[PDB]
Design a protein around this ligand. Structure first.
Ligand SMILES: CCCc1ccc(S(N)(=O)=O)cc1
Ligand SMILES: OC[C@H]1O[C@@H](O)[C@H](O)[C@@H](O)[C@@H]1O
Ligand SMILES: [Zn+2]
Length: 257
């Protein structure tokens, strides 16, 4: 199956997922000079006060922090979005070295990692139906750069030892995702896709301009995870990012002037 290596990585995905060569694939490079302020964007509302985290899972590609999405609790509204999008999970993409790891790039610059908070449009009832819709998902993307530690990330870092290998999970209740945000909600937005198979073209991307800082020690612990399962040869979970894809017939809009 698919992965990030030479023999199963992004350059191979199109053979089983032909939409990999589609018209609205993600990530993209964000050319900041060409992105245009859009006065039609409404204020963005990130409402995570009642979020209910449940579990953290090593799925063999990254680790996912999962939320209870059975009611309107943690939601994203406003900005480019029509209606209410409910938080279901977050995960990261990161590099083997601090100079790469992000999926989106900013004027071609790669960050050390990228956080994706994944939400589905409640008008479609369930995540599975939402991924059959052009406006089914909204992903809030946040860049990570290496500098000072991010206190709200440390609980994640410290549980990774217990989910080292593919298929391992651990309880992860009472985690507040508000601690992963930067100060500013300035953002860029464009229509795109999932960045892993099945690469479905369902996503409104909202990429924050301000990165968060994490410490070298924090990201080094991400890099100690394993792609492999328990009892199998160790393959460090690094470089689990898809490179930028063609922009095609799209425009990136900015929330700021
Ligand atoms: C079942 C699909 C799950 C899924 C794949 C990829 C992403 S991402 N990297 O945020 O575009 C989010 C959800
Ligand atoms: O025709 C003019 C329009 O062109 C579009 O491509 C831009 O997104 C709009 O901001 C602009 O007003
Ligand atoms: Zn992602």
């Amino acid at each position: 199956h698919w992965g990030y290596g030479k023999h199963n990585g992004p350059e191979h995905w199109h053979k089983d997922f032909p939409i990999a060569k589609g018209e609205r694939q993600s990530p993209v490079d964000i050319d900041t000079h060409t992105a245009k302020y859009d006065p039609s964007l409404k204020p963005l509302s990130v409402s995570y006060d009642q979020a209910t985290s449940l579990r953290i899972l090593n799925n063999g590609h990254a680790f996912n922090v999962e939320f209870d999405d059975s009611q309107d609790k943690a939601v994203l509204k406003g900005g480019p979005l029509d209606g209410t999008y409910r938080l279901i999970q977050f995960h990261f993409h990161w590099g083997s070295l601090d100079g790469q790891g992000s999926e989106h790039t900013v004027d071609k610059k790669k960050y050390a990692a990228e956080l994706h908070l994944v939400h589905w449009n409640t008008k479609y009832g369930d995540f599975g139906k939402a991924v059959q819709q052009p406006d089914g998902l909204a992903v809030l993307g946040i860049f990570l750069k290496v500098g000072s530690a991010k206190p709200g990330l440390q609980k994640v870092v410290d549980v990774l030892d217990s989910i080292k290998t593919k298929g391992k999970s651990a309880d992860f209740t009472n985690f507040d995702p508000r601690g992963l945000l930067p100060e500013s909600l300035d953002y860029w937005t464009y229509p795109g896709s999932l960045t892993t198979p099945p690469l479905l073209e369902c996503v409104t991307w909202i990429v924050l301009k301000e990165p968060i800082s994490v410490s070298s020690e924090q990201v080094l612990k991400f890099r100690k995870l394993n792609f492999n399962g328990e009892g199998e040869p160790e393959e460090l979970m690094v470089d689990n990012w898809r490179p930028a894809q063609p922009l095609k017939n799209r425009q990136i809009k900015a929330s700021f002037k």
